[PDB]
Design a protein around this nucleic acid. Structure first.
Lengths: 92, 96, 79, 109, 108, 90, 96, 80
DNA sequence: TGGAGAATCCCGGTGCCGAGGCCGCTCAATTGGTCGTAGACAGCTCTAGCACCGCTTAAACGCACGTACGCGCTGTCCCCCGCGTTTTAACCGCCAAGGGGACTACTCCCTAGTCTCCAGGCACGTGTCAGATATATACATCC
DNA sequence: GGATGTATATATCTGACACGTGCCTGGAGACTAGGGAGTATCCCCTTGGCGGTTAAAACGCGGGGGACAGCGCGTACGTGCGTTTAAGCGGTGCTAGAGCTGTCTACGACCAATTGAGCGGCCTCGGCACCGGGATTCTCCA
């Protein structure tokens, strides 16, 4: 069974070095990541089906993030995603 | 002259506007309100007529449902008059 | 300042359709604010759906998708 | 013959897996095709949201003088922020409790 | 070959089995779609369509109208508890609301 | 592509002297599309839950049982089973 | 001695909003779950985690309903909750 | 049978204290028992449908999670 | 309680536009065969669920008392409803510019598919540190 | 101003979090192939303006009824205390059935040819909106 536990632990040690986490909190974080993933992927699928497109690009994920996430959260999430996409394209 | 008691014309209006299907807000002021709301998001934006009619139907249905909940909040406080506290109570319970 | 075009008799008619018998004088400003918040929430998603499609016109289907986005599904304009 | 294996997350500067998100997008029956930048973008968004939740959860744990995050701190993290409460309005956190709120008409004079 | 018989005809249905089948193929729901699933879903959609249309025709006959307008569909859906539960987050355009005045507002 | 002629066929099966307007046809077409999307999304979700790649008639049956309320669900399962039994035997 | 009527209620509010534990005892809720489930399917098995998930969801639902009930009773200028407040909150949410 | 009385009056009182309620009527408890019975009937009916679709005789936690996710009452902490 | 007047219901005539039927035709559903794989079926294992028993103890239950509070009643005065009059601007019809949505062709680059392989991630095991608990002192509320 | 609920500080236990290690399997590199979409005139339709007209909105005035504050009362919850009872923990026993694996076979994807069903367009007549007259509730006042 796959889970996001080591990744959430990596982000936690990236932002709070002397702070741990419990197993139930890790399960809640895994459920949160799965719920957000399902929401954004479903909204991107609906965006692709409405626009008669058969692919999901970064544009569909950006529009899904703007549609789902509230304001400042959406702005910072679009900034983080665009930064990651530019870093991924600049490095081969 | 002839003068109806307060509440008779109100109940007549309730029966008349619950029997009918028509849109109650004027069309052109609502259209201008839609364009001034949309110009805060994107400038030089056009609108189909059917989009404005869809917004008006959704907005009128939302306001009528909110007024029903507001009326029941006012009746809960042993009142007939609705105040903003009834609307705020309804949007608090709905989660808005 | 076209929120004042949502007139007080129009709010009175919408309350009559909701079965409201007697209305205070401060209802109308709150109803205009509620209508502005609701229209901002729907119109923002409609503009987002329009900008994803690379268009300048907001269609009725953009409004229908925006209303289905927060569970206010509208029957009669396509779908 | 083959070059060194570099992960797609390290090229993006991310900690969440790009490849797992790409696999879950491909088998999730979302679309017929999935672009290359979509898992990178989605992993970045998920990592940012995880970082925001863990920021406010670590602050809530520090305020209660505890160096481990329990679900109560996650509930404080989500419900004490307006946008995270808007994102998680229909979401119940197990062993999370409620925020301490007593109405002013119930408090003694 | 033989005579071309419609899949809706051998299922005893009026809704199209083939169109629902091709919409289940192209809707990106699952990788494979079985043979009896469009027949089942067409029967279900035909039943729900008949359930709304019967009460809509009864409401149109109650208002002395030969045709069905949206007001009749709104009466048909909202006056039935199961249809109001199914379509509780659905706005019928040009549908109005039911006559419902609370008892405390009527005169004594 | 619309469900107009099929809704008209069902209407003449139910109410042979009663017609339907264009806005009412649009509303009924939207109703059929919405209920189709609900049942097909539930069937896709329940296929993904049980590690299946096929939407069978059982998936549609339990999606109808999950979505529709009681008497509607019981009757809709009844015409679904009747239609599948008629289709397989003929 | 004897405290005034209301202060122990305020300390109960402070000590139960500070805690995360399940306010309903496990065995009566488990027996209620198997009593309700017997009407649908006969001779069922239940995981412990399924009953705990049901209990967490039920306690969260009842706490949110009591919050809406409390603000409904405050709207009617009362500090006592009554079943009409519960019924009004369930109507405005849409559960009735 | 008659297991709705196991949800005691102090349990409903404790839930009201968590909900911020200072004073409770005596007719609240039967109403809360009926509300809880309706909610549990809906969620357990959906979970029984889920576990009988999968040809199991055991109701799992994930079945309850999907039963609550259908009703817009998503629950974290159980693998959802 | 009767009567004046206002609103509403019923009946008939008229015109209109939109629903309903007919027809060409094209395109999507049907038919028949093939192929590979998802899933039904049998079996086995060992995991977790159910049933039962003892005990000890936290919590529920029953009862008594009294006081806070819900609720009915009364007055008052203000705010909103009703209605007539005047102003305003919405609505309908008509007419142009012109921005922009929809269709089509092509060509290219992006992404599915596959083989190979190796390193990230998962399962398991262990020591060790963070809460939980227990008790004395003193600070913060309560009446 | 005397009586309780709880911060605050020091010791000890323990079990669950975190780190180390080994295998394994899924992601990554490299290559190819083919099809999705990105980019380059035309008619619908959206916006902008003018004129008339007339329905609706704004405004002012009177008054009446309803919100709201105060007050009394009677009762029904809150709180506290003594008795009971069954939840909770620990332990044992056993047996259904969840989950995994192997086999094979039926069934659905897929492709090619055929053909009829449904869709766009067009024409027609009848259901319904509307106007006018007159009878039937229906509300308010003396």
């Amino acid at each position: 069974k796959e889970s996001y536990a080591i990744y959430v632990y990596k982000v936690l040690k990236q932002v709070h070095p002397d702070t741990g986490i419990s197993s139930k909190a890790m399960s809640i974080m895994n459920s949160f990541v799965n719920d957000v993933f399902e929401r954004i992927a479903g909204e991107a699928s609906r965006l692709a089906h409405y626009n008669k497109r058969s692919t999901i690009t970064s544009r569909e994920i950006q529009t899904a993030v703007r549609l789902l996430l509230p304001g400042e959260l959406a702005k910072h999430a679009v900034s983080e995603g665009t930064k990651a996409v530019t870093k991924y394209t600049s490095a081969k | 002259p002839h003068r109806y008691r307060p509440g008779t014309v109100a109940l007549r209006e309730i029966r008349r506007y619950q029997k009918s299907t028509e849109l109650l807000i004027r069309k052109l002021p609502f259209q201008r309100l839609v364009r001034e709301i949309a110009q805060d998001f994107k400038t030089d934006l056009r609108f189909q007529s059917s989009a404005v009619m869809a917004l008006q139907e959704a907005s009128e249905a939302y306001l009528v449902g909110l007024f029903e909940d507001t009326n029941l909040c006012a009746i809960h406080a042993k009142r007939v008059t609705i105040m903003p506290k009834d609307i705020q109570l309804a949007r608090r319970i709905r989660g808005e | 300042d076209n929120i004042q075009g949502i007139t007080k008799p129009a709010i009175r008619r919408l309350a009559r359709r909701g079965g409201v018998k007697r209305i205070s004088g401060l209802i109308y400003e709150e109803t205009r604010g509620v209508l502005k918040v609701f229209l901002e929430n729907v119109i923002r998603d409609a503009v987002t759906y329009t900008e994803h499609a690379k268009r300048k016109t907001v269609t009725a289907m953009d409004v229908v998708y925006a209303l289905k986005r927060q569970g206010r599904t509208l029957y009669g304009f396509g779908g | 013959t083959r070059a060194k294996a570099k992960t797609r997350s390290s090229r993006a500067g991310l900690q969440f897996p790009v490849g797992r998100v790409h696999r879950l997008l491909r088998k999730g029956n979302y679309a017929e095709r999935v672009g290359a930048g979509a898992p990178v973008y989605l992993a970045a968004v998920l990592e940012y949201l995880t970082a925001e939740i863990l920021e406010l959860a670590g602050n809530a744990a520090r305020d209660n003088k505890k160096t481990r995050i329990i679900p109560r701190h996650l509930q404080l993290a989500v419900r004490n922020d307006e946008e995270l409460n808007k994102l998680l309005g229909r979401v119940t956190i197990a062993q999370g409790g409620v925020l301490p709120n007593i109405q002013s008409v119930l408090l003694p004079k």
